[PDB]
Design goal:
The structure is a homodimer of 928-residue chains.
Chain A (H helix, E strand, L loop, with lengths): L10 E9 L7 H10 L19 H9 L12 E2 L8 H5 L3 H16 L4 H4 L4 E6 L4 H6 L9 H6 L1 H12 L5 E5 L4 H14 L5 E8 L5 H9 L24 E9 H7 L5 E10 L11 H15 L8 E3 L8 H12 L10 E4 L2 H4 L6 H15 L17 H4 L1 E3 L14 E7 L4 E8 L10 H20 L6 E7 L2 H16 L1 H4 L3 H9 L6 E7 L2 H12 L7 E4 L8 E4 L11 H6 L1 H18 L3 H6 L13 H22 L6 E4 L4 H8 L4 H21 L7 E5 L3 H7 L7 E7 L2 E6 L1 H12 L6 E3 L14 H7 L11 E3 L7 E2 L9 H9 L2 E2 H10 L4 E4 L6 H11 L6 E3 L8 H14 L34 E2 L7
Chain lengths: 928, 928
Amino acid sequence: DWSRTRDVEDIAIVGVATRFPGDLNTPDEMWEALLEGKDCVTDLPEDRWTEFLDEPRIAERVKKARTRGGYLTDIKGFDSEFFALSKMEADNIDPQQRMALELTWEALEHARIPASSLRGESVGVYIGSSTNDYSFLAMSDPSIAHPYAITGTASSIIANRVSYFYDFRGPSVAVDTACSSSLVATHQGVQALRAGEADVAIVGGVNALVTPLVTVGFDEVGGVLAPDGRIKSFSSDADGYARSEGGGMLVLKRISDARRDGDQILAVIAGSAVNHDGRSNGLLAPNPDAQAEVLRKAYKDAGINPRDVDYIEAHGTGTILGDPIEADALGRIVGKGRPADKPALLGAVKSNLGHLESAAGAASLAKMTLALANDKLPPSINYAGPNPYIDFEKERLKVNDTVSDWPRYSGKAIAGVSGFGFGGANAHVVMREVLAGDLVETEAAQRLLEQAREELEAKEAEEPTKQLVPLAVSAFLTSRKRQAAAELADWIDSPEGRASSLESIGRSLSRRNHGRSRAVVLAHDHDEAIKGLRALAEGKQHPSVLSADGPVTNGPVWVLAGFGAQHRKMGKSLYLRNEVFAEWINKVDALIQDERGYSILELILDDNVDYTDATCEYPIEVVQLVIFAIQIALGELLRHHGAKPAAVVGQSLGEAAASYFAGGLSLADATRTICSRSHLMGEGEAMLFGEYIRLMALVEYSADEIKTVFSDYPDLEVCVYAAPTQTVIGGPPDQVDAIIARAESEGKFARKFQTKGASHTQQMDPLLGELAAELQGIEPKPLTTGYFSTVHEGTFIRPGSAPIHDVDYWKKGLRHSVYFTQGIRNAVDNGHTTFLELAPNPVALMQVGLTTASAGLHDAQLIATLARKQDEVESMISAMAQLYVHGHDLDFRTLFPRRSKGLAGALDFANIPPTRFKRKEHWLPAHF
Amino acid sequence: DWSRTRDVEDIAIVGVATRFPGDLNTPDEMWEALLEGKDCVTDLPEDRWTEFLDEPRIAERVKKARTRGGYLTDIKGFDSEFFALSKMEADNIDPQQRMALELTWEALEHARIPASSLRGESVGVYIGSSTNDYSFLAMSDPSIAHPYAITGTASSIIANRVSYFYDFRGPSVAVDTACSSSLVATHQGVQALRAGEADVAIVGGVNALVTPLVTVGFDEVGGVLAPDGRIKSFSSDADGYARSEGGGMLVLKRISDARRDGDQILAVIAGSAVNHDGRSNGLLAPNPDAQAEVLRKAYKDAGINPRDVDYIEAHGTGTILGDPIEADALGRIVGKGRPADKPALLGAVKSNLGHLESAAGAASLAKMTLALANDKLPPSINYAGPNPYIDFEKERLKVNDTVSDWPRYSGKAIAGVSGFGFGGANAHVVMREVLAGDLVETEAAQRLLEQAREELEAKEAEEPTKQLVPLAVSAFLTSRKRQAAAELADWIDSPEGRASSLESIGRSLSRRNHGRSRAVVLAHDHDEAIKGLRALAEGKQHPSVLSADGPVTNGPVWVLAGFGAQHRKMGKSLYLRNEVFAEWINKVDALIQDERGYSILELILDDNVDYTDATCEYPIEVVQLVIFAIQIALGELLRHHGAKPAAVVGQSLGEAAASYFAGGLSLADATRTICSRSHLMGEGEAMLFGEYIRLMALVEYSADEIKTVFSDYPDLEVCVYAAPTQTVIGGPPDQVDAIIARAESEGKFARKFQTKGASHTQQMDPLLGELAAELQGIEPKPLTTGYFSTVHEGTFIRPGSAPIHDVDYWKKGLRHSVYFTQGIRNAVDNGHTTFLELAPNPVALMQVGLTTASAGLHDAQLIATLARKQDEVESMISAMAQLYVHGHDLDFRTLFPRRSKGLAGALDFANIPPTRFKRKEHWLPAHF
């Protein structure tokens, strides 16, 4: 009967912004005013229309007109610095465009969607507008009017400037169906979202009373404007309406996308329809048959029986003739068949706000969104009693003149919203409340795993650990960022701030816009948060504050080192307390068990594994395996939070991990590589001992210089070029032990490595045949990331290049030197300044630091991930905070996953101060 | 790959209207200009902008500006009488609204869709507009500006006034995406048609250069306007553009509806898309990435591989920077992968017309529609050579600078149309030619049927019959109707008229608007048509011309009589030459064979059946059956052409047919009724003879008066009250033969009926039991039509009343008198003036005529259907013409069914003169 014939989705309303008479600038302010029954119509303000009141003819004509209405408080103000407009351009921009920009910002903030996250996305903008009032001000003097007025007053620019400033790529159109323009814009946004063509829709309408021309015209018509300026909707003393200025906006998404993204659904749009009067009894006469038809069309589109409607937000313009016609059409469709005791409730926000001609629909939609979200029906005002020409009982309608509950005739709250243009264009939108249905749809290692969780629980019971919460603050300017920090600190010190959980404060901040000037405060409690924010408000450096004036130019470089980074309990704390990290550790552990026939997970969880000779069966082999597993898991944890390397570089065991993150090999293939060499190096060491051993040592000699010294020590080779002034060499002990003295002659640094791996030297000649045999079957792929190979003499390989990770590549890299310091320098020449080391302990960062300074870079960003004697969970948060502050890819929202899935959370977010604007006066000097 | 993901229909373009510079006012004029490469940019006309050129400051500023452009010839003219606007209202209406009204009329006429047939239908209107130039003229003097300017210059009224004047009920919206507004409007119309929500879409755009303000602003910007005013699209000497005024419109339907309705499909819209630049390098800078994305989106929506495009109608504004950007995006999407020898052809109508800012898309769409329909590509002009900053060969593009053929790379012609707004809103529409695939998907009676067709063929061979063709002419005023007739007559006398088949002239006229003042000329050849039209041009009454100044108030009354209407060959000629009539005769013939065991079709086809005693086995019975069959078939033939009775009335055998057309019984049930009585009356007559017979006679005595005479003739009864002063009585012959002398005493008229049916009298008492037995099982239904029962004492039964056609109703009607003259009078009191007799011969119309005059109605419309000694096919055409001229329901298009189904007809329509408008000067007196 009334079921949908087409297969479409419901549309969720996720955010609302308002700028309405009576100083209603937020949804909460509007809701309080509606509950109180506030009358927002006032006298014409003294400082308005002054460009016309110095001419006595116009002045006397205006004094004779009604002129009471809904006026805004500060129409000339505008934050032109925030929206990046020069003084002259700002002076020429219509207030309607200003309101479009501001309302878009406020609506996105209310929806808890960061504006930065929508840049480049398919966001449609649909705004209703009916009057180019500001153009008349510019046209006062045709000769001297500035050409900026052309773009500053064109109707299309109302939508186009919003699309331009926010970098929206969806459809962008201004629509005019004069008095129902907002509802028509909403209808177009809904249709767009249903057809694809847009993933988010910004819909609304604006209106401004810049000049008295339209008001004087309507006054000259006669019998249109109420003598006292009050709209008495459906009342017995109804005698016309009054004009009002303002605007509103809504943010719309498909309900499935809203559920997936975790948006709070305020209300649901089930359907809508638009039509026209046709040939009515005059162009300006409303047609009841057409209104009935638009009602029927809308409820068929929504798939809802009109008998079930609880509330109608009416056109309600308070004309003695229009109100009975609207009531008659409603009685034909909405009221038909109802019992006398279940009437549809009726009201009109125009009785509060006046007639917001092209923004009237936006005001109505905002009222109904707030009524559904807050589960109350606000009164309609100026109601002295029923219009005698309307049989309310027979039409099955009742005017709601108090605060009342939703009847919920069908079990859920349903409402309809009507708007009729004075040219005959009609619209109706059907809404319903959000429902619950909308929001839905190793053996021995196991022993050690339990023994670790129990001991952590027992340790926790004795003393709880204070969780680290990162607090993000940002703006388009450093000065604005500092001001926001100061205001945030006061609210946190406030009683309402102290009553909010620190995690909820962090979650709210994480859903705000992430601008170009960024800072993060790492806080364990409120008092620490206050201290850090106050320090940020000044220029005072604080150890708990990460900050930067702007982003760096290029992306980060991931450094896959790992020699000498092992220690007793590496990775264990992070494995227990982070699910993503544990998942990838298990994944790598499965692969190694196949290839090597044991589990690395047991070594990680066991506390007596010192990764030395006295506690591990094969120390040389397993240490490389565990470090590789940790490197894979740390990198995947970073990917989970939205980080991605711009380029990669490895060193002597991290090549396997570097190969994986560059896209060269798959995880299995990279696992096969490291598994093969580690056990081959381990096997070789036992075969040779006594005099056959080759030691590894570090010296203070450069690469070019080393060519001279090797003339008289032929046996020695170079393993890795670590720093410009440091190198690692290997060879016979007598030719090696001597060189320590050869260095001590000139007071240089030199020390011996106490490990018997002896890689990149002679010992690996016997191994190369087996390595090729074991690696026979790996499938190199073209690189998806920049790659600074330390095997191919430090060269830079661009993304998308031909595959390079062949068998001979691993054969070569295992045997010959590592060109690490060369690789770093090449990276610095391409403009990289951020270097991120994935390791259990940062040892390669110092080597990277020396190279960067040697290349003329003393402010390089050197970010560690894990470190001995530092809490592993805190280290990862700090690393991700540093990436974020310097503008690198990082989704701060993923740091605050939602605990509550349903509608009963209500505490996931704190009521942090909104973004503050600095409004300056911008207006055209004009005289008539 | 490029196949549609959504299931949608293609959209057909069925009509085009144009108002473009260079006096291009019809699609044919525009096509000729395009083939000739006409340059339509001129100097500013002398009589334009004069309201500003009397102030020396403005005058000097304007003289310094470029000001060459595409200007209309007569912008102040308007036929305000045609569009029903007063002088003061017309003076205040923006030329954009005027153009919207006129272009809608011209587009519907070009589509051969009568405007009257769309009144009340779901017709959507979508019009692009970007400037309220006329408002500035009204705002010159704020005090004395008339309030009519409010509705006369609002943007929304551009669409709303069209919807109002034509009685369209679909969506009605004005859109502004400044320079691509027309394409965006087209996109919205396509989306509407695909979603339902509209069955016809009127889409287009308008623009007017009322004042110099915008031109002077763009001139003051600098580097925007071409110094010589010529748009040199993609040329090496491109230096800006010039502004132009005008408008265009298209009529759109779903392709299935166009095929079903027999519209000529000019071209097909396969898909379209709209998006925005986002944050480009400045608000006014075009973004190549966004343009590429809109291209990809549009071709995905169309389900077409962009590699197959033959022609791109470009934005092409001739800027030295914009043209390479457009070419670059095209090369990214349209050109990619093509071989060097199959480039996409490129052009721009802006090189012909200038820049028609919000109507530019309409001009582009019109050009491509005509190019596809006429199978040619017109040149792009002002092309001195390729822009050196565009590598045309590499982009796989070629500028089309001559007249050329469609390459048809994929086997069919495909084109794309682009438009980019200066605020960053982009649009692309994909078109293709119409394809052939779019336009697809009793035994003895048989002996007599063949013998009749052969004899008709033989008769035809000796002399052909000149077919009667009805020619419809109408207007909103009688004076305009006469003028149209005079102009039509001249064109028919013209050599081109004489070369057109008279049927094609009639078909074209039948597809024109059917206004309130109507006339039909019944013509067998051109010369007769000319003579009738000339007579209509004056007030001269002519026997071949039916005419009326306006419609009558109420619908027609169908009169189902039939006693005494039989004759030798009734129905035979119409049965052979009309398929619909034959089909229903066969249907009734099947029913009667079941009930009565013989075929009436044999009697109709046989020529020796005189319906008398010497030639029919049962004359009394079969005559009623044949007349009933003819009455059913004639009424169904009228229904096929769109006629429907407002009320029905029967008489003494037509009650059965009257019952059927009122909706009381089904055809089977009504057939059972008449079959039962006819054979019962026939059986009764043989049973009684000699002295038992009762005769029927007619006298000149009224109903009230008859009560006196019956005092001394107790046996006599009254059968039917025919006229106020005439009655039919029946009874014993001696009491009946006497009364003829009783009447002759006072010189009154009286005659005897020579038939032995003797109905509505004593003889039917024995029959009533069997009649109820035979009729036991009929299912009366509530009436769907007004009904003046002559059984229930002439009463009027309203439609929707309770069922009345029970068994006792037939029992009663068969026995008691027929209140016919009473029934007619009741009809006249409800305001009926048209009475239509369904009979083989009009005998009841004279009785109806006498009653209507007696009730004070001397201009009643008394329409016969068939008549003895008149050609049956001509009689039916004349009857339907009379219904049409008086405004009754009749679809004149059904009188001219199409012969050719495919694309090769090309002769179904004649090139009759278009509707002529009388333009008067309407403008605002204004001074600055």
